[PDB]
mmCIF file of C-alpha atoms in Angstrom:
data_model
loop_
_atom_site.group_PDB
_atom_site.id
_atom_site.type_symbol
_atom_site.label_atom_id
_atom_site.label_comp_id
_atom_site.label_asym_id
_atom_site.label_seq_id
_atom_site.Cartn_x
_atom_site.Cartn_y
_atom_site.Cartn_z
ATOM 1 C CA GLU A 17 -23.807 -8.758 -80.315
ATOM 2 C CA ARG A 18 -20.086 -10.294 -81.008
ATOM 3 C CA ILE A 19 -17.898 -7.359 -81.488
ATOM 4 C CA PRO A 20 -14.151 -7.863 -82.837
ATOM 5 C CA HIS A 21 -11.369 -6.406 -79.836
ATOM 6 C CA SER A 22 -10.266 -4.304 -82.339
ATOM 7 C CA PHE A 23 -13.294 -1.914 -82.545
ATOM 8 C CA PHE A 24 -14.025 -3.384 -79.116
ATOM 9 C CA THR A 25 -10.635 -0.967 -78.037
ATOM 10 C CA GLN A 26 -10.738 1.358 -81.023
ATOM 11 C CA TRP A 27 -14.272 2.884 -79.682
ATOM 12 C CA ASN A 28 -13.475 2.753 -75.674
ATOM 13 C CA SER A 29 -10.823 4.673 -76.433
ATOM 14 C CA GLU A 30 -12.463 7.163 -78.282
ATOM 15 C CA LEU A 31 -15.261 7.032 -75.763
ATOM 16 C CA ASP A 32 -12.411 7.379 -72.794
ATOM 17 C CA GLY A 33 -10.811 10.218 -74.303
ATOM 18 C CA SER A 34 -14.521 12.397 -75.185
ATOM 19 C CA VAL A 35 -14.825 12.552 -71.223
ATOM 20 C CA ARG A 36 -15.193 15.669 -69.758
ATOM 21 C CA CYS A 56 -11.413 31.042 -29.730
ATOM 22 C CA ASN A 57 -14.540 31.771 -27.820
ATOM 23 C CA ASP A 58 -14.761 34.094 -31.451
ATOM 24 C CA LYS A 59 -18.284 34.304 -33.340
ATOM 25 C CA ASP A 60 -16.467 34.827 -36.415
ATOM 26 C CA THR A 61 -15.339 31.512 -37.215
ATOM 27 C CA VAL A 62 -18.960 30.172 -36.541
ATOM 28 C CA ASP A 63 -20.524 32.951 -38.155
ATOM 29 C CA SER A 64 -18.324 31.832 -41.200
ATOM 30 C CA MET A 65 -19.452 28.096 -41.245
ATOM 31 C CA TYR A 66 -22.934 29.422 -41.648
ATOM 32 C CA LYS A 67 -21.746 31.519 -44.373
ATOM 33 C CA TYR A 68 -20.265 28.167 -46.059
ATOM 34 C CA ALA A 69 -23.249 25.724 -45.516
ATOM 35 C CA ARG A 70 -25.964 28.717 -46.774
ATOM 36 C CA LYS A 71 -23.798 29.111 -50.332
ATOM 37 C CA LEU A 72 -23.560 25.121 -50.281
ATOM 38 C CA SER A 73 -27.360 25.008 -49.726
ATOM 39 C CA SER A 74 -27.535 27.376 -52.675
ATOM 40 C CA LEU A 75 -25.524 26.026 -55.125
ATOM 41 C CA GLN A 76 -27.939 22.641 -53.947
ATOM 42 C CA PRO A 83 -32.276 12.643 -65.477
ATOM 43 C CA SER A 84 -32.710 15.944 -67.248
ATOM 44 C CA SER A 85 -35.356 16.008 -70.099
ATOM 45 C CA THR A 86 -33.204 15.987 -72.981
ATOM 46 C CA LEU A 87 -30.845 13.239 -71.703
ATOM 47 C CA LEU A 88 -34.168 11.162 -71.634
ATOM 48 C CA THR A 89 -35.951 12.526 -75.200
ATOM 49 C CA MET A 90 -31.861 11.593 -76.626
ATOM 50 C CA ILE A 91 -31.636 7.996 -74.803
ATOM 51 C CA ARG A 92 -35.076 7.168 -76.771
ATOM 52 C CA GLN A 93 -33.953 8.385 -79.834
ATOM 53 C CA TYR A 94 -30.938 6.747 -79.402
ATOM 54 C CA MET A 95 -32.333 3.016 -78.483
ATOM 55 C CA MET A 96 -35.038 3.398 -81.185
ATOM 56 C CA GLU A 97 -32.475 4.258 -83.903
ATOM 57 C CA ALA A 98 -30.330 0.989 -82.070
ATOM 58 C CA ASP A 99 -33.380 -1.496 -82.143
ATOM 59 C CA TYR A 100 -34.450 -0.636 -85.474
ATOM 60 C CA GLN A 101 -30.797 -1.074 -87.003
ATOM 61 C CA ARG A 102 -30.844 -4.595 -85.387
ATOM 62 C CA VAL A 103 -33.982 -5.542 -87.777
ATOM 63 C CA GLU A 104 -32.743 -3.565 -90.642
ATOM 64 C CA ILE A 105 -29.512 -5.781 -90.330
ATOM 65 C CA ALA A 106 -31.180 -9.133 -90.155
ATOM 66 C CA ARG A 107 -33.341 -8.132 -93.717
ATOM 67 C CA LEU A 108 -30.170 -7.198 -95.265
ATOM 68 C CA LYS A 109 -29.214 -10.976 -94.279
ATOM 69 C CA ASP A 110 -32.458 -12.463 -95.432
ATOM 70 C CA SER A 111 -32.083 -10.272 -98.843
ATOM 71 C CA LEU A 112 -28.528 -11.247 -98.667
ATOM 72 C CA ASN A 113 -29.367 -15.091 -99.049
ATOM 73 C CA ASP A 114 -31.840 -14.247 -101.784
ATOM 74 C CA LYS A 115 -29.270 -13.050 -104.045
ATOM 75 C CA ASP A 116 -26.859 -15.609 -103.214
ATOM 76 C CA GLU A 117 -29.314 -18.096 -104.709
ATOM 77 C CA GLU A 118 -30.405 -15.272 -106.888
ATOM 78 C CA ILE A 119 -26.347 -15.941 -108.090
ATOM 79 C CA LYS A 120 -26.779 -19.446 -107.391
ATOM 80 C CA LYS A 121 -29.402 -20.963 -109.393
ATOM 81 C CA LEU A 122 -27.801 -18.445 -112.390
ATOM 82 C CA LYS B 13 -14.800 7.863 -86.131
ATOM 83 C CA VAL B 14 -16.174 4.645 -84.207
ATOM 84 C CA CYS B 15 -18.041 6.553 -81.303
ATOM 85 C CA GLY B 16 -20.443 8.395 -82.475
ATOM 86 C CA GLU B 17 -20.626 11.602 -81.212
ATOM 87 C CA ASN B 18 -24.356 10.928 -79.733
ATOM 88 C CA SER B 19 -22.648 8.189 -78.056
ATOM 89 C CA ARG B 20 -20.256 10.409 -76.278
ATOM 90 C CA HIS B 21 -23.140 13.229 -75.419
ATOM 91 C CA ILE B 22 -25.577 10.179 -73.871
ATOM 92 C CA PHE B 23 -22.312 9.080 -72.087
ATOM 93 C CA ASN B 24 -21.251 12.189 -70.877
ATOM 94 C CA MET B 25 -24.578 13.045 -69.724
ATOM 95 C CA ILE B 26 -25.046 9.957 -67.560
ATOM 96 C CA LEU B 27 -21.734 10.724 -66.105
ATOM 97 C CA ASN B 28 -22.457 14.138 -64.735
ATOM 98 C CA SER B 29 -26.331 13.079 -63.021
ATOM 99 C CA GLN B 30 -23.993 10.522 -61.267
ATOM 100 C CA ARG B 31 -20.970 11.982 -60.061
ATOM 101 C CA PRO B 32 -21.660 13.712 -56.224
ATOM 102 C CA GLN B 33 -21.184 17.044 -56.100
ATOM 103 C CA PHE B 34 -20.811 16.812 -52.235
ATOM 104 C CA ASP B 35 -19.042 13.963 -50.703
ATOM 105 C CA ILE B 36 -20.318 14.061 -46.769
ATOM 106 C CA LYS B 37 -15.879 13.559 -45.959
ATOM 107 C CA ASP B 38 -15.484 15.997 -48.161
ATOM 108 C CA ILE B 39 -18.025 18.638 -47.255
ATOM 109 C CA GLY B 40 -16.771 18.641 -43.399
ATOM 110 C CA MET B 41 -19.867 16.474 -41.629
ATOM 111 C CA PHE B 42 -16.844 14.284 -39.649
ATOM 112 C CA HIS B 43 -14.785 17.958 -39.310
ATOM 113 C CA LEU B 44 -17.923 19.018 -37.389
ATOM 114 C CA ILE B 45 -18.817 16.244 -35.350
ATOM 115 C CA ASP B 46 -14.843 16.408 -34.056
ATOM 116 C CA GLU B 47 -15.273 20.420 -33.648
ATOM 117 C CA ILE B 48 -18.228 19.041 -31.311
ATOM 118 C CA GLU B 49 -16.764 16.405 -29.358
ATOM 119 C CA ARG B 50 -13.278 18.846 -28.908
ATOM 120 C CA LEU B 51 -15.732 21.786 -27.559
ATOM 121 C CA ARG B 52 -17.380 19.414 -25.235
ATOM 122 C CA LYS B 53 -14.535 18.710 -23.885
ATOM 123 C CA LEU B 54 -13.378 21.780 -23.152
ATOM 124 C CA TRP B 55 -17.191 23.152 -21.791
ATOM 125 C CA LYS B 56 -16.455 19.728 -19.430
ATOM 126 C CA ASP B 57 -13.481 20.874 -18.563
ATOM 127 C CA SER B 58 -14.407 24.782 -17.646
ATOM 128 C CA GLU B 59 -17.242 22.994 -15.888
ATOM 129 C CA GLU B 60 -14.826 21.053 -13.546
ATOM 130 C CA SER B 61 -12.648 23.593 -13.344
ATOM 131 C CA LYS B 62 -14.830 25.929 -11.782
ATOM 132 C CA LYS B 63 -16.280 23.290 -8.895
ATOM 133 C CA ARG B 64 -12.828 22.854 -7.839
ATOM 134 C CA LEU B 65 -12.579 26.762 -7.780
ATOM 135 C CA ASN B 66 -16.116 26.894 -5.976
ATOM 136 C CA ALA B 67 -14.044 24.317 -3.542
ATOM 137 C CA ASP B 68 -11.034 26.682 -3.470
ATOM 138 C CA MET B 69 -13.491 29.486 -2.441
ATOM 139 C CA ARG B 70 -15.452 28.632 0.565
ATOM 140 C CA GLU B 71 -12.068 27.439 1.968
ATOM 141 C CA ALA B 72 -9.719 30.771 1.473
ATOM 142 C CA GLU B 73 -13.086 33.001 2.251
ATOM 143 C CA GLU B 74 -13.380 30.895 5.708
ATOM 144 C CA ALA B 75 -9.803 30.773 6.499
ATOM 145 C CA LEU B 76 -9.634 34.751 6.074
ATOM 146 C CA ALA B 77 -13.496 34.439 8.390
ATOM 147 C CA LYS B 78 -11.218 32.870 11.050
ATOM 148 C CA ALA B 79 -8.098 34.995 10.640
ATOM 149 C CA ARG B 80 -10.603 37.988 10.984
ATOM 150 C CA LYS B 81 -12.010 36.532 14.232
ATOM 151 C CA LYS B 82 -8.653 36.174 15.668
ATOM 152 C CA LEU B 83 -7.725 39.733 14.925
ATOM 153 C CA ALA B 84 -10.400 41.214 16.868
ATOM 154 C CA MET B 85 -9.835 39.034 20.100
ATOM 155 C CA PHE B 86 -5.918 40.264 19.699
ATOM 156 C CA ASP B 87 -7.567 43.710 19.328
ATOM 157 C CA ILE B 88 -10.195 43.316 22.051
ATOM 158 C CA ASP B 89 -7.259 42.275 24.999
ATOM 159 C CA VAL B 90 -4.731 45.003 23.439
ATOM 160 C CA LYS B 91 -7.239 47.897 24.297
ATOM 161 C CA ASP B 92 -7.677 46.746 27.626
ATOM 162 C CA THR B 93 -4.126 46.441 28.594
ATOM 163 C CA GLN B 94 -3.922 49.814 27.107
ATOM 164 C CA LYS B 95 -6.466 50.758 29.535
ATOM 165 C CA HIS B 96 -5.169 49.238 32.215
ATOM 166 C CA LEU B 97 -1.419 50.849 31.693
ATOM 167 C CA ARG B 98 -3.719 54.397 31.258
ATOM 168 C CA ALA B 99 -4.356 54.108 34.692
ATOM 169 C CA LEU B 100 -1.164 52.771 36.083
ATOM 170 C CA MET B 101 0.164 55.876 34.511
ATOM 171 C CA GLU B 102 -2.234 58.232 36.086
ATOM 172 C CA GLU B 103 -1.799 56.083 39.125
ATOM 173 C CA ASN B 104 2.267 56.416 39.335
ATOM 174 C CA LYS B 105 2.100 59.912 38.463
ATOM 175 C CA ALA B 106 0.144 60.586 41.215
ATOM 176 C CA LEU B 107 2.579 58.558 43.374
ATOM 177 C CA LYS B 108 5.389 60.490 42.272
ATOM 178 C CA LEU B 109 3.675 63.928 42.936
ATOM 179 C CA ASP B 110 3.350 63.026 46.524
ATOM 180 C CA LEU B 111 7.113 62.080 46.941
ATOM 181 C CA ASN B 112 8.040 64.946 45.118
ATOM 182 C CA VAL B 113 6.917 67.448 47.337
ATOM 183 C CA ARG C 18 -34.817 6.934 -91.847
ATOM 184 C CA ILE C 19 -37.428 5.240 -89.227
ATOM 185 C CA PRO C 20 -41.087 4.097 -90.764
ATOM 186 C CA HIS C 21 -43.661 5.989 -88.525
ATOM 187 C CA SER C 22 -45.180 2.865 -87.861
ATOM 188 C CA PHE C 23 -41.940 1.137 -86.396
ATOM 189 C CA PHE C 24 -41.686 4.178 -84.370
ATOM 190 C CA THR C 25 -45.097 4.789 -82.471
ATOM 191 C CA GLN C 26 -44.609 0.783 -81.845
ATOM 192 C CA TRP C 27 -41.752 1.551 -80.172
ATOM 193 C CA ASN C 28 -42.201 4.336 -77.600
ATOM 194 C CA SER C 29 -45.357 3.106 -76.957
ATOM 195 C CA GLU C 30 -43.563 -0.699 -76.150
ATOM 196 C CA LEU C 31 -40.935 1.277 -74.206
ATOM 197 C CA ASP C 32 -43.121 3.195 -72.076
ATOM 198 C CA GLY C 33 -45.494 0.457 -71.077
ATOM 199 C CA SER C 34 -42.441 -1.642 -69.448
ATOM 200 C CA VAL C 35 -41.715 1.423 -67.793
ATOM 201 C CA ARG C 36 -41.946 1.330 -64.135
ATOM 202 C CA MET C 37 -41.154 4.026 -61.513
ATOM 203 C CA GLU C 38 -39.883 2.288 -57.976
ATOM 204 C CA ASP C 39 -39.816 3.721 -54.355
ATOM 205 C CA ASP C 40 -38.875 0.892 -52.554
ATOM 206 C CA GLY C 41 -37.478 3.273 -50.098
ATOM 207 C CA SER C 42 -33.658 2.256 -51.183
ATOM 208 C CA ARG C 43 -32.603 5.824 -52.262
ATOM 209 C CA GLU C 44 -33.910 7.132 -49.505
ATOM 210 C CA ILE C 45 -32.107 9.030 -46.919
ATOM 211 C CA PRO C 46 -32.231 8.056 -43.451
ATOM 212 C CA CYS C 47 -33.587 10.395 -41.346
ATOM 213 C CA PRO C 48 -31.279 12.176 -38.363
ATOM 214 C CA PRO C 49 -30.680 11.089 -34.864
ATOM 215 C CA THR C 50 -30.727 14.182 -31.979
ATOM 216 C CA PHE C 51 -28.473 16.680 -32.699
ATOM 217 C CA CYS C 52 -28.228 18.349 -29.357
ATOM 218 C CA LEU C 53 -25.728 17.664 -26.348
ATOM 219 C CA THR C 54 -28.194 17.201 -22.856
ATOM 220 C CA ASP C 55 -25.045 18.233 -21.098
ATOM 221 C CA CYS C 56 -21.085 17.666 -20.767
ATOM 222 C CA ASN C 57 -20.920 14.412 -20.512
ATOM 223 C CA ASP C 58 -23.383 13.337 -23.402
ATOM 224 C CA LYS C 59 -21.014 11.669 -25.681
ATOM 225 C CA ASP C 60 -23.548 9.244 -27.196
ATOM 226 C CA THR C 61 -25.249 11.974 -28.594
ATOM 227 C CA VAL C 62 -21.539 12.824 -30.452
ATOM 228 C CA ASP C 63 -21.788 9.142 -31.053
ATOM 229 C CA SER C 64 -24.892 8.534 -32.265
ATOM 230 C CA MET C 65 -23.555 11.887 -35.111
ATOM 231 C CA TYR C 66 -20.357 9.655 -36.141
ATOM 232 C CA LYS C 67 -22.948 6.864 -36.628
ATOM 233 C CA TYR C 68 -25.412 9.781 -38.883
ATOM 234 C CA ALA C 69 -22.522 10.742 -40.914
ATOM 235 C CA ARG C 70 -20.636 7.286 -41.318
ATOM 236 C CA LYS C 71 -24.191 5.345 -42.309
ATOM 237 C CA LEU C 72 -24.868 8.601 -44.694
ATOM 238 C CA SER C 73 -21.548 8.844 -46.005
ATOM 239 C CA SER C 74 -21.052 4.934 -46.513
ATOM 240 C CA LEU C 75 -24.818 4.712 -47.341
ATOM 241 C CA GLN C 76 -24.621 6.395 -51.283
ATOM 242 C CA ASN C 77 -21.500 8.878 -52.045
ATOM 243 C CA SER C 78 -19.307 5.198 -51.627
ATOM 244 C CA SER C 79 -21.668 3.088 -51.977
ATOM 245 C CA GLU C 80 -24.369 4.565 -54.697
ATOM 246 C CA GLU C 81 -21.338 4.667 -57.050
ATOM 247 C CA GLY C 82 -21.596 0.905 -57.388
ATOM 248 C CA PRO C 83 -25.229 0.482 -58.427
ATOM 249 C CA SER C 84 -24.560 3.472 -60.895
ATOM 250 C CA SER C 85 -21.978 1.685 -62.237
ATOM 251 C CA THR C 86 -24.212 -0.672 -63.458
ATOM 252 C CA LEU C 87 -25.667 1.859 -65.620
ATOM 253 C CA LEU C 88 -22.778 2.899 -66.526
ATOM 254 C CA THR C 89 -21.388 -0.560 -68.212
ATOM 255 C CA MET C 90 -24.921 -1.250 -69.589
ATOM 256 C CA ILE C 91 -24.664 2.041 -70.848
ATOM 257 C CA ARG C 92 -21.134 1.433 -72.698
ATOM 258 C CA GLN C 93 -21.583 -2.057 -73.826
ATOM 259 C CA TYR C 94 -25.413 -0.904 -75.351
ATOM 260 C CA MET C 95 -23.809 1.942 -77.222
ATOM 261 C CA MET C 96 -20.171 0.180 -78.232
ATOM 262 C CA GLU C 97 -23.247 -2.539 -79.779
ATOM 263 C CA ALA C 98 -25.069 0.160 -81.684
ATOM 264 C CA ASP C 99 -22.070 2.034 -83.820
ATOM 265 C CA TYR C 100 -20.575 -1.259 -84.311
ATOM 266 C CA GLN C 101 -23.753 -1.871 -86.228
ATOM 267 C CA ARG C 102 -23.737 1.268 -88.052
ATOM 268 C CA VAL C 103 -20.536 -0.344 -89.610
ATOM 269 C CA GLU C 104 -22.261 -4.081 -90.027
ATOM 270 C CA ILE C 105 -24.872 -2.235 -91.505
ATOM 271 C CA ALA C 106 -22.781 -0.257 -94.312
ATOM 272 C CA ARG C 107 -20.763 -3.219 -95.272
ATOM 273 C CA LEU C 108 -23.811 -4.873 -96.094
ATOM 274 C CA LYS C 109 -25.748 -2.261 -97.737
ATOM 275 C CA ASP C 110 -21.939 -2.504 -99.926
ATOM 276 C CA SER C 111 -22.056 -6.261 -100.458
ATOM 277 C CA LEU C 112 -26.129 -5.942 -101.555
ATOM 278 C CA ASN C 113 -24.658 -3.615 -104.090
ATOM 279 C CA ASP C 114 -22.044 -5.651 -105.236
ATOM 280 C CA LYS C 115 -24.284 -8.391 -105.907
ATOM 281 C CA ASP C 116 -26.748 -5.941 -107.999
ATOM 282 C CA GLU C 117 -23.961 -5.034 -110.374
ATOM 283 C CA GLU C 118 -23.099 -8.869 -110.252
ATOM 284 C CA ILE C 119 -26.498 -10.331 -110.914
ATOM 285 C CA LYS C 120 -26.447 -8.482 -114.318
ATOM 286 C CA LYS C 121 -23.561 -9.516 -115.552
ATOM 287 C CA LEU C 122 -25.163 -13.363 -114.869
ATOM 288 C CA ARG C 123 -28.099 -11.839 -117.217
ATOM 289 C CA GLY C 124 -25.327 -11.343 -120.454
ATOM 290 C CA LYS D 13 -40.956 -7.966 -80.212
ATOM 291 C CA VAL D 14 -39.863 -3.692 -81.602
ATOM 292 C CA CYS D 15 -38.344 -2.279 -78.260
ATOM 293 C CA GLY D 16 -35.286 -4.874 -76.731
ATOM 294 C CA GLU D 17 -35.433 -6.217 -73.606
ATOM 295 C CA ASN D 18 -31.756 -3.897 -73.080
ATOM 296 C CA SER D 19 -33.671 -1.145 -74.496
ATOM 297 C CA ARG D 20 -35.896 -1.278 -71.714
ATOM 298 C CA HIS D 21 -33.768 -2.495 -68.742
ATOM 299 C CA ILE D 22 -31.165 0.743 -69.260
ATOM 300 C CA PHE D 23 -34.357 3.272 -69.632
ATOM 301 C CA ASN D 24 -35.711 1.533 -66.646
ATOM 302 C CA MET D 25 -32.300 2.489 -64.637
ATOM 303 C CA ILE D 26 -32.005 5.800 -66.263
ATOM 304 C CA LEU D 27 -35.170 6.730 -64.913
ATOM 305 C CA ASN D 28 -34.411 5.239 -61.583
ATOM 306 C CA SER D 29 -30.982 6.752 -61.707
ATOM 307 C CA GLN D 30 -30.685 8.901 -58.790
ATOM 308 C CA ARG D 31 -27.721 10.493 -57.027
ATOM 309 C CA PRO D 32 -29.355 10.244 -54.835
ATOM 310 C CA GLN D 33 -29.458 14.060 -53.773
ATOM 311 C CA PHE D 34 -27.974 15.293 -49.726
ATOM 312 C CA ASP D 35 -29.852 18.089 -49.231
ATOM 313 C CA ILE D 36 -28.052 20.030 -46.645
ATOM 314 C CA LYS D 37 -30.557 21.092 -44.610
ATOM 315 C CA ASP D 38 -31.818 17.649 -43.797
ATOM 316 C CA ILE D 39 -28.595 16.220 -43.352
ATOM 317 C CA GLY D 40 -28.260 18.484 -40.597
ATOM 318 C CA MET D 41 -24.922 20.781 -41.575
ATOM 319 C CA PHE D 42 -26.959 23.732 -40.318
ATOM 320 C CA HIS D 43 -28.161 22.038 -36.938
ATOM 321 C CA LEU D 44 -24.382 20.855 -36.575
ATOM 322 C CA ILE D 45 -23.286 24.128 -36.519
ATOM 323 C CA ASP D 46 -26.539 25.181 -34.873
ATOM 324 C CA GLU D 47 -24.658 23.356 -31.466
ATOM 325 C CA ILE D 48 -21.374 24.592 -32.366
ATOM 326 C CA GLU D 49 -22.679 28.184 -31.449
ATOM 327 C CA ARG D 50 -24.394 26.624 -28.874
ATOM 328 C CA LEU D 51 -21.538 25.014 -27.008
ATOM 329 C CA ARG D 52 -19.419 28.186 -28.225
ATOM 330 C CA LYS D 53 -22.085 30.320 -25.265
ATOM 331 C CA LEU D 54 -21.390 27.410 -22.754
ATOM 332 C CA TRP D 55 -18.106 27.383 -22.788
ATOM 333 C CA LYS D 56 -17.944 30.972 -22.735
ATOM 334 C CA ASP D 57 -20.433 31.330 -20.079
ATOM 335 C CA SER D 58 -18.446 28.891 -17.669
ATOM 336 C CA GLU D 59 -15.498 30.570 -18.400
ATOM 337 C CA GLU D 60 -16.892 33.849 -18.162
ATOM 338 C CA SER D 61 -17.667 32.663 -14.728
ATOM 339 C CA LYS D 62 -14.149 31.508 -14.133
ATOM 340 C CA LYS D 63 -12.959 34.274 -14.913
ATOM 341 C CA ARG D 64 -15.033 36.974 -12.079
ATOM 342 C CA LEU D 65 -14.523 33.722 -9.722
ATOM 343 C CA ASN D 66 -10.634 33.764 -9.983
ATOM 344 C CA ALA D 67 -10.375 37.383 -9.344
ATOM 345 C CA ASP D 68 -12.836 36.732 -6.160
ATOM 346 C CA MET D 69 -10.316 34.051 -4.955
ATOM 347 C CA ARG D 70 -7.301 36.079 -5.670
ATOM 348 C CA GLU D 71 -8.488 39.218 -3.084
ATOM 349 C CA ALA D 72 -9.393 36.302 -0.569
ATOM 350 C CA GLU D 73 -6.282 35.176 -0.591
ATOM 351 C CA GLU D 74 -4.873 38.489 -0.098
ATOM 352 C CA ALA D 75 -7.010 39.749 2.373
ATOM 353 C CA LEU D 76 -6.242 36.819 4.023
ATOM 354 C CA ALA D 77 -2.433 37.239 3.776
ATOM 355 C CA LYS D 78 -2.628 40.584 5.268
ATOM 356 C CA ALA D 79 -5.219 39.490 7.669
ATOM 357 C CA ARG D 80 -2.009 36.402 8.889
ATOM 358 C CA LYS D 81 1.097 39.330 8.907
ATOM 359 C CA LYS D 82 -1.016 41.443 11.151
ATOM 360 C CA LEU D 83 -2.130 38.201 13.607
ATOM 361 C CA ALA D 84 2.250 37.944 13.597
ATOM 362 C CA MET D 85 2.223 41.508 15.083
ATOM 363 C CA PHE D 86 -0.571 41.463 17.140
ATOM 364 C CA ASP D 87 1.339 38.421 18.823
ATOM 365 C CA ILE D 88 4.407 40.681 19.418
ATOM 366 C CA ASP D 89 2.536 43.260 20.901
ATOM 367 C CA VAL D 90 0.324 41.690 23.016
ATOM 368 C CA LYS D 91 3.685 39.935 25.159
ATOM 369 C CA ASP D 92 5.496 43.259 24.888
ATOM 370 C CA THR D 93 2.041 45.399 26.435
ATOM 371 C CA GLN D 94 1.863 42.486 28.803
ATOM 372 C CA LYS D 95 5.774 43.085 30.098
ATOM 373 C CA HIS D 96 5.031 47.014 29.946
ATOM 374 C CA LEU D 97 2.341 46.342 32.542
ATOM 375 C CA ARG D 98 4.227 44.424 34.629
ATOM 376 C CA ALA D 99 6.948 46.849 35.097
ATOM 377 C CA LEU D 100 4.586 49.529 35.914
ATOM 378 C CA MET D 101 2.553 47.102 38.477
ATOM 379 C CA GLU D 102 6.038 46.818 39.723
ATOM 380 C CA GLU D 103 7.127 50.833 39.723
ATOM 381 C CA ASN D 104 3.392 51.379 41.177
ATOM 382 C CA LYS D 105 3.929 49.084 43.921
ATOM 383 C CA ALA D 106 6.856 50.327 44.751
ATOM 384 C CA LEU D 107 5.961 53.552 45.012
ATOM 385 C CA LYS D 108 3.564 53.236 47.470
ATOM 386 C CA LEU D 109 5.971 51.054 49.766
ATOM 387 C CA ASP D 110 8.286 54.260 49.641
ATOM 388 C CA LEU D 111 5.045 56.706 50.439
ATOM 389 C CA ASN D 112 3.227 53.982 53.073
ATOM 390 C CA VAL D 113 6.936 54.017 54.965
ATOM 391 C CA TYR D 114 8.019 57.734 54.880
ATOM 392 C CA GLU D 115 4.191 58.482 55.720
ATOM 393 C CA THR D 116 4.603 56.081 59.079
ATOM 394 C CA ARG D 117 7.885 57.895 60.140
ATOM 395 C CA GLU D 118 6.609 61.188 59.286
#
């Protein structure tokens, strides 16, 4: 929502530091290179991790709003007393 | 601390799902096309050079044929005079024999 | 910890908004002809360069643009979730402090 | 309400997220190499024919060179033998003339 720039700067820094001629021989080398390159040529675990993650994040939002309401309740429970 | 491990793991996975493990310039597509065009020019030059050698060959063979025609003309005449020469020698010898008795 | 009701409502709500698309944007264009008809066929070689230029420009240089949108959006998303974790912790501590403070008022 | 619009937008982008992949056979790499090898044979076949024709050409030029030297000798031989003929004809004429004079005198 509103993120203090001190946290913005530390979080970015934390994330960005965790990123981790007339010859036939040569023609046959081209096929060979493209044959291994072809052999060398979104995961289900990414999809299931981002699902849990976003579910937590959205649940934290209403959990925040719940605490804020319960916070004003305690204030007038202080305020009256 | 601040950046959760789950936050890092998801970002890393996404980073690896977007990176191009085969850049077309990098894998050599343009170099191969460069080679086709280069070979095309060499092939064209050879076909052109072969065309001119045929034109050089037709002239060389024609002049050789003309020389051989001349060689036969000269040989026929040479042999002909040599034939008359031998006859005159036979005739001269006989005349000397008459004078010599 | 997540209540089971929130869990089922969220997952189903995400799935009902999922839309898999093929407008053809991320599809690869078909190649021209790769055979020179004769030693003067430079048009075909040109068509090869045109395809290769179309190809490399198409995604590898270009698809890093729309994929950056995901990278920036996921970045702000997760920084927000991670910050709310500290905001939650602060609000809970603030709630516990007022619990101990409500009792003093009774005395 | 529960699933944030932001959560949906990102999940949709990830599902629709694609490299997208370039299959090497599809982009034409093997076809490109096939054409290189095809050009190699066309170039080599032309060069082989050019090799073989050059040897026929040098042979014709060499035989032409031998013939023209012979053509130079024959021109010398023709004129010289004609001169030898004239000398023998003159000798023949004179010998007959001597014989015909001396016989009439006898």
